[PDB]
From Swiss-Prot:
Protein name per its UniProtKB record: Flagellar radial spoke protein 1
Function: Flagellar radial spokes contribute to the regulation of dynein arm activity and thus the pattern of flagellar bending. They consist of a thin stalk, which is attached to the a subfiber of the outer doublet microtubule, and a bulbous head, which is attached to the stalk and appears to interact with the projections from the central pair of microtubules.
Source organism of the structure: Chlamydomonas reinhardtii
Post-translational modifications: Asymmetrically dimethylated at Arg-230 and Arg-371 during flagellum resorption. Probably methylated by PRMT1.
Shown residues within the full chain: 14 to 444 of 814
Source superkingdom: Eukaryota
Keywords noted in UniProt: Cell projection, Cilium, Cytoplasm, Cytoskeleton, Flagellum, Methylation, Repeat
Positions bearing Asymmetric dimethylarginine: 230, 371
Subcellular localization, as worded in the UniProt entry: Cytoplasm, Cytoskeleton, Flagellum axoneme
Subcellular location, principal: cytoplasm
Annotated Gene Ontology cellular component terms: cytoplasm; cytoskeleton; membrane; motile cilium
Length: 387
């Protein structure tokens, strides 16, 4: 059992939030799984966030940190080689929140897999954070030796971007640095050969808000006008209770509601309406806890909306009572900037035909012009999800 955590609070009542996140890297070298406060569990239960009191083994290891994560090394697969750790703070628009705006910031590591003695130590990161204005620091890297066991190197370089997954090229450069500068060798680094500057996996924290053009720009310095948008929905259900007649899964409805300055709804696109002046709904013509399969596809042609709209809320619900959200696991939304084009549906005949016809040309698949801007979801438990 391994325990990793930062301890910044100095009092459990304070509200300022710091996310300590992990990024896995397989033998292939590509990003395999991700971890953060929105996604408590990753890698089939091997990596479990501390606040979640479920999804973790019955064998109990209790620590005293704040954003602690537990890792159980036996449950891992063979492919997963490296785990990078990134400590970050979100960026609220009106206050300039950064890492150093806290009483303290330390890194506590515990190795307790050996019986009798529990090893625990605390590095400090505050003097590294204080220099300049920084939001995400690569705290540490852990890698598997060819003979087994985990080695914890400490490569730390500050960065201004506040989102792990926005610094994916920097993480891969950390891996390459580990291979070259230091003696030890990982087979994945031999496959990391090429590096793409604009390669980012999206992670969105609660209440994060950004201008659409900025989020669509990312690392690319050139702003791209948000001309069209595609909203994708996906809901996943728990398994049903074993008992007589098999109960039926509910059919959820989605309700996008456009509002006006005075507070009245202008045009709403919903499972029933299916149409509006500027909104077209529907596409033209082993248990994965976080599976994503699209149910509907809402479109939004940015310039063509009625000029009196001000805010568009997307609610998802079934109004049947006495059930709440019981037997509903996850409800997830993904925005897609689609102004430059739409990627063909994965598994569609045209998609596979084009991918096979198109030569690699140094790229596994031709670059999909679509650019994900936000992957935000809400999770629910087995039974508590009622009322």
């Amino acid at each position: 059992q391994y325990s990793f955590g930062i301890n910044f609070k100095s009092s459990p009542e304070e509200k300022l939030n710091f996310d300590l996140s992990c990024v896995a890297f397989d033998v292939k070298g590509q990003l395999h799984d991700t971890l953060h406060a929105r996604k408590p569990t990753a890698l089939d239960g091997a990596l479990v966030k501390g606040f979640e009191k479920q999804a973790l083994p019955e064998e109990t290891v209790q620590v005293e940190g704040d954003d602690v994560i537990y890792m159980f090394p036996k449950k891992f697969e063979r492919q997963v080689e490296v785990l990078l750790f990134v400590a970050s703070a979100p960026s609220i628009p009106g206050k300039k929140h950064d890492l150093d705006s806290s009483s303290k910031l330390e890194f506590a590591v515990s190795y307790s897999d050996v019986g009798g003695q529990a090893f625990n130590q605390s590095f400090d990161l505050k003097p590294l954070a204080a220099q300049g204005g920084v939001s995400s620091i690569i705290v540490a890297v852990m890698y598997l030796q060819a003979e087994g066991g985990w080695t914890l190197r400490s490569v730390g370089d500050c960065h201004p971007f506040d989102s792990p997954g926005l610094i994916v090229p920097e993480l891969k450069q950390t891996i390459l640095n580990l291979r070259d500068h230091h003696g030890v060798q990982l087979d994945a680094a031999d496959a990391i050969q090429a590096i793409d500057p604009a390669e980012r996996v999206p992670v969105t924290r609660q209440f994060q808000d950004q201008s659409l053009d900025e989020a669509s720009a990312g690392r690319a310095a050139e702003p791209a006008p948000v001309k069209k948008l595609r909203i994708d929905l996906s809901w996943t259900f728990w398994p049903p209770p074993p008992p007589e007649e098999p109960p039926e899964e509910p059919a959820l409805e989605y309700n996008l509601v456009m509002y006006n300055k005075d507070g009245e709804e202008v045009q709403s696109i919903s499972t029933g309406n299916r149409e509006a002046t500027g909104a077209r709904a529907g596409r033209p013509e082993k248990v994965d806890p976080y599976e994503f399969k699209e149910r509907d596809v809402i479109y939004l042609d940015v310039p063509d909306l009625p000029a009196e709209v001000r805010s568009m809320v997307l609610l998802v619900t079934n109004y049947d009572e006495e059930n709440g959200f019981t037997r509903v696991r996850t409800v997830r939304c993904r925005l897609v900037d689609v102004s430059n084009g739409e990627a063909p549906l994965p598994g569609s005949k045209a998609a596979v035909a084009a991918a096979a016809a198109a030569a690699e040309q140094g790229l596994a698949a031709p670059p999909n012009p679509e650019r994900v801007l936000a992957d935000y979801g809400v999770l629910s438990k087995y039974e508590d999800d009622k009322a």
